C-alpha cells in the first residue's frame, strides 16, 4: 500500500459515488476513500522520496492529505443524513482538491 | 480550511447534539464535528501565526485537535450502539475540550 | 499510561470483533478501535519518553498509529457493506499489525541485560 495505490483508490471510489443510486453505496465508497486518505498520509509520494520527513514540505503533504480526510468525512455526514445528491455534489467538488494533491506530488 | 469556521462548526453541532432525539441525529452531528476537527488541525490558528509550522507548539496544537477527533469518534461509537444519553454526555465533555482549545488558540 | 491504555482498548475490541454475530457489533467495535488509534497517536509510548516530540522517531510512531487507523477504517467500510466475515478477517490481520507496533514501542525493561 503505497501512495499511488491510495490515490488510485480515491479515483476509483469517486467514480463509484458518481454512479451510485443510494446512500449505503455512497457511504461505503466514502469509507474506502477515508481509509485511503489516512493511508496516503503515512506514505511517501515520489516528489518526497528523499526529503526529510520532518521537513516543512513533508508536513505540508501530510496536512494536505488530512484536508482530504476532512472533506471526505463531511461528505459522509451528508450521505448519512440521506442527502445523497448533496454528498455526490460534495464528492465531485473534493475531486478537484484530490486532483490538486495528486498533481503536486505524483511522478 | 480556516480554524475559526471549524470552531463555529464544532459549536453549532454541539447544540444540535444537545437537542437531538435519536441516535442518527447524534451520529450525523458528530460526523460534522469530526470533519471540522480534522480540518482545524490543518489550519494555523491566530496564536500560532508567529511560529514555525514545524515547531513544538504547532505540533502540540495538531495533537490537541487529534485528541478532540478521538473523543468525537468514541462518542460516535456510543451513539452507534444506540446509547444516545451516553453519547450526549460524552459530547458535554467534548464541549469543555473545544472551549479550552478555542480559548487557548484564538 | 495513555499509550498502553489505547493498546489495551485495541486488543479488547479485536476480541469483540472475533466473537461478533452481526455487522453492527463489528462496526461499533471498530469505531472504538478507531478512537483508540487516534488517541494513541497523541500519546507518548515508553520507547519515546526521552525523545523530542518533533523528532523523526516520534513522527514515525505517529505515522504507524495512523497506519492502524487506516486499516481499521477499511475494515469499517467492509462491515458497513455487510461483509461481516470479510471485516472479521481484516481485523485478524489488523491484530498482527497492532502486535508489531506494541512490541516496537512498549517498555523493554523486563528484557534488559538478558
Ligand atoms: Ca496502482
Ligand atoms: Ca503498489
Ligand atoms: Ca459563520
Ligand atoms: Cl487523523
Ligand atoms: Cl475474549
Ligand atoms: Zn492525523
CSV table of C-alpha atoms in Angstrom, one decimal, chain A residues 1 23-25 27-28 31-32 34-36 38-39 41-42 52-54 62 66 80, chain C residues 34 54-56 59 62-64 66-67 69-71 73-74 76-78 80-81 83:
chain,number,residue,atom,x,y,z
A,1,UNK,CA,0.0,0.0,0.0
A,23,UNK,CA,-26.8,6.3,0.5
A,24,UNK,CA,-25.3,3.0,1.5
A,25,UNK,CA,-23.3,2.7,-1.7
A,27,UNK,CA,-21.2,5.8,2.3
A,28,UNK,CA,-19.2,2.6,1.7
A,31,UNK,CA,-15.3,5.0,3.9
A,32,UNK,CA,-12.9,3.3,1.5
A,34,UNK,CA,-11.3,7.8,4.1
A,35,UNK,CA,-9.1,4.7,4.6
A,36,UNK,CA,-7.1,5.5,1.5
A,38,UNK,CA,-5.4,8.2,6.0
A,39,UNK,CA,-3.1,5.6,4.4
A,41,UNK,CA,-0.8,10.5,4.8
A,42,UNK,CA,1.5,7.7,6.1
A,52,UNK,CA,13.4,14.7,5.5
A,53,UNK,CA,10.0,13.5,6.9
A,54,UNK,CA,10.2,16.4,9.5
A,62,UNK,CA,0.6,15.2,5.4
A,66,UNK,CA,-5.7,15.4,6.2
A,80,UNK,CA,-25.6,9.6,6.5
C,34,UNK,CA,-10.5,3.9,15.6
C,54,UNK,CA,9.4,16.8,16.8
C,55,UNK,CA,12.0,14.0,16.2
C,56,UNK,CA,11.9,11.7,13.2
C,59,UNK,CA,6.9,11.2,13.8
C,62,UNK,CA,2.6,8.8,15.0
C,63,UNK,CA,2.6,7.6,11.3
C,64,UNK,CA,2.5,4.0,12.5
C,66,UNK,CA,-2.2,6.4,11.5
C,67,UNK,CA,-1.5,3.2,9.6
C,69,UNK,CA,-6.3,3.9,11.8
C,70,UNK,CA,-6.3,3.4,8.0
C,71,UNK,CA,-6.6,-0.4,8.4
C,73,UNK,CA,-11.3,2.3,8.6
C,74,UNK,CA,-11.0,-0.1,5.7
C,76,UNK,CA,-15.3,-0.5,8.9
C,77,UNK,CA,-16.0,0.0,5.2
C,78,UNK,CA,-16.3,-3.8,4.8
C,80,UNK,CA,-20.7,-1.2,6.6
C,81,UNK,CA,-21.3,-3.1,3.4
C,83,UNK,CA,-19.3,-8.1,4.6
